[PDB]
Amino acid sequence: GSSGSSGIVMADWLKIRGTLKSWTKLWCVLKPGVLLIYKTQKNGQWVGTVLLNACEIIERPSKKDGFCFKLFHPLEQSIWAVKGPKGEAVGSITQPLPSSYLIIRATSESDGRCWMDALELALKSGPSSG
């Protein structure tokens, strides 16, 4: 359980696999048993939401490439919310994304380590349980 103050877990600029050509620095928001992603913090067109009902982290720092990881579902499920924050199918239409897994990138091994870590906790934190 992460008793910081607000429901949200953490928010930072994470890099996503550059399927277009260059990694995309989206605004990922770590929530309690959920993760949100937004094109930016300013406007915030929203990209999609990730569900952490019971996802795990394996990590993928690769040989030499800062630090990264992969969050997939062991019970083979959809790691995507039916809607979004404001109950919306989708916000914007950008690069393609996965369904089961989700590759993310952090700034420094630490950051990522905290991300890939918090995540594990988040899911292991449940949606405000008690």
Swiss-Prot record:
Belongs to the OSBP family. This is Oxysterol-binding protein-related protein 8. It comes from the Eukaryota. Residues 8-124 form the PH domain. It comes from Homo sapiens. Widely expressed. Expressed at higher level in macrophages. The gene is OSBPL8. Interacts with SPAG5. Interacts with NUP62. Lipid transporter involved in lipid countertransport between the endoplasmic reticulum and the plasma membrane: specifically exchanges phosphatidylserine with phosphatidylinositol 4-phosphate (PI4P), delivering phosphatidylserine to the plasma membrane in exchange for PI4P, which is degraded by the SAC1/SACM1L phosphatase in the endoplasmic reticulum. Binds phosphatidylserine and PI4P in a mutually exclusive manner. Binds oxysterol, 25-hydroxycholesterol and cholesterol. The lineage of its organism: Eukaryota, Metazoa, Chordata, Craniata, Vertebrata.
